[PDB]
Amino acid sequence: RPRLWEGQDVLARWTDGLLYLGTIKKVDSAREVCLVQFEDDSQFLVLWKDISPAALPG
């Protein structure tokens, strides 16, 4: 039932309006964000709204 989970590869929309590939580290249901780790090892909170799975629709 959860759409997002720890260890999931995702695309996250950043403050420049572009998508970046990352991996979910933590899911925060209270604030509806995930801590996402990016390719440069940076980690930021991203709104659920701005996150989608990288995996093929199937």
Partner: peptide
């Protein structure tokens, strides 16, 4: 990855 660089997807 340390020293890695972010690029916009696709």
């Amino acid at each position: 990855s340390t020293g890695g660089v972010k690029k916009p997807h696709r």
